[PDB]
Amino acid sequence: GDERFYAEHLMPTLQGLLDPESAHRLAVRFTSLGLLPFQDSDMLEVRVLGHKFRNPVGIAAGFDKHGEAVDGLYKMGFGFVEIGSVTPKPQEGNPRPRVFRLPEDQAVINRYGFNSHGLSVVEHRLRARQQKQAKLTEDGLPLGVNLGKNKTSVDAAEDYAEGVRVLGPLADYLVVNVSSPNTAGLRSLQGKAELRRLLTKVLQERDGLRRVHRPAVLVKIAPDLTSQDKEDIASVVKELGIDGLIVTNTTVSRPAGLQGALRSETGGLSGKPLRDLSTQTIREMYALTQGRVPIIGVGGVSSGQDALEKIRAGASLVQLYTALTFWGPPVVGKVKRELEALLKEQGFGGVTDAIGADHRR
Ligand SMILES: Cc1cc2nc3c(=O)[nH]c(=O)nc-3n(C[C@H](O)[C@H](O)[C@H](O)COP(=O)(O)O)c2cc1C
Numbered sequence: 342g343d344e345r346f347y348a349e350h351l352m353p354t355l356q357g358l359l360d361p362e363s364a365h366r367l368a369v370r371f372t373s374l375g376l377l378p379f380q381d382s383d384m385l386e387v388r389v390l391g392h393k394f395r396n397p398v399g400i401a402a403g404f405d406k407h408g409e410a411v412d413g414l415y416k417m418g419f420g421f422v423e424i425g426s427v428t429p430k431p432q433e434g435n436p437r438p439r440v441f442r443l444p445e446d447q448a449v450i451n452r453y454g455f456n457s458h459g460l461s462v463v464e465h466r467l468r469a470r471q472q473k474q475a476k477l478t479e480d481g482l483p484l485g486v487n488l489g490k491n492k493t494s495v496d497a498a499e500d501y502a503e504g505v506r507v508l509g510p511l512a513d514y515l516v517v518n519v520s521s522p523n524t525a526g527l528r529s530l531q532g533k534a535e536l537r538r539l540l541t542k543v544l545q546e547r548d549g550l551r552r553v554h555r556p557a558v559l560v561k562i563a564p565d566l567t568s569q570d571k572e573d574i575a576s577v578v579k580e581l582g583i584d585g586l587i588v589t590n591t592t593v594s595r596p597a598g599l600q601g602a603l604r605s606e607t608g609g610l611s612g613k614p615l616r617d618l619s620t621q622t623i624r625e626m627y628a629l630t631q632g633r634v635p636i637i638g639v640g641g642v643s644s645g646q647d648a649l650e651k652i653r654a655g656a657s658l659v660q661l662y663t664a665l666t667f668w669g670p671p672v673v674g675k676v677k678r679e680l681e682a683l684l685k686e687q688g689f690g691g692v693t694d695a696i697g698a699d700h701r702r
């Protein structure tokens with residue numbers, strides 16, 4: 342794949358010809374077809390959420406919102422794949438432009454608004470490769486499905502309930518996405534009272550599925566939570582027995598120092614400016630849950646060091662997206678190779694040993 346060629350020539354030129362969204366669409370197409378340019382060592386293997394992951398680096402929700410490039414993403418080197426956010430009924434999302442590049446900050450701002458083909462379309466798309474996925478999962482390549490809610494929905498809880506019943510049987514884990522900053526009032530569902538009611542219904546629906554079709558349930562949270570919000574989330578998670586957390590979605594904050602001309606566009610900020618804010622949220626949730634709740638770290642990961650910092654902070658797995666938009670497919674292998682080297686360099690027998698290491702030092 343040659344990391345330098347992509348980061349210095351291919352990607353840059355591409356960004357100079359097409360707009361963010363068009364580039365994304367093209368990316369999904371090429372990926373789905375397997376038109377892509379490192380062997381995983383046992384050190385990168387991780388066992389959590391009732392599954393084995395050959396490596397802890399996954400593709401974050403948002404790149405493959407409709408589940409169209411799952412196989413191509415596995416081919417890219419990801420240890421697990423999570424498909425964007427799916428809503429019960431189809432919806433176009435916000436008007437364009439709704440995605441912006443901040444190259445000077447190695448960041449992105451997006452306000453898609455949950456553009457989704459809907460549960461039915463995604464359901465049939467995953468059913469067409471359900472058994473193939475069964476073998477991939479058994480092989481250490483799990484599939485996650487991220488659930489959202491429609492813009493005009495009145496009963497948010499019912500929207501997620503539907504997602505559980507329709508896609509739950511096809512996923513190794515489900516994600517209750519209540520941290521999207523582009524859907525009015527969605528984040529308010531992170532409140533203790535609302536989250537408890539919401540997760541109680543989700544878990545009940547999940548427990549009603551046949552055993553082999555019973556996925557783990559995780560909640561994806563924002564990086565803009567107050568200390569109180571985090572304490573409440575942790576409490577609800579332990580009270581209901583949530584299987585895990587996905588730490589920090591994009592941020593509505595705008596860290597001082599941003600240079601991008603489009604820094605003041607409305608939307609969620611991703612990439613490097615979000616990295617440490619995300620790592621710190623992971624560190625806090627890990628401690629609040631006594632390290633007993635699996636955490637998938639996401640936010641500004643572009644190197645082995647970025648991944649290990651989140652792992653040491655408490656993440657059992659990590660994900661990336663924005664880095665892919667700047668460095669291209671080669672970034673996946675780069676992250677894995679650097680993570681492996683750093684693990685050895687720091688005396689860790691493997692990823693598992695480093696999980697939460699900072700809390701024990
Ligand atoms: C263009 C774009 C679309 C996204 N769409 C979703 C989504 O539908 N659901 C979700 O849970 N997160 C979504 N995210 C958030 C990512 O999954 C991730 O939480 C965040 O971008 C931080 O990781 P990164 O800095 O490596 O991109 C999106 C991010 C971007 C940049």
Ligand SMILES: NC(=O)c1cc(C(=O)O)cc(-c2ccc(-c3ccccc3)cc2)c1
Pocket residue numbers: 352355356360361362364365367368371372376377378404440442665666667669670
């Ligand atoms: N928002 C995005 O998802 C996004 C934004 C941009 C951008 O330039 O803004 C670029 C990409 C992108 C384009 C092509 C490839 C690719 C795939 C297979 C083989 C070679 C290259 C990967 C990522 C995605």
Ligand SMILES: O=C(O)c1cc(=O)[nH]c(=O)[nH]1
Pocket residue numbers: 426451452453454455456518520521522523590591609
């Ligand atoms: O579809 C979107 O706008 C979206 C959803 C989400 O969870 N995060 C994000 O940054 N964008």
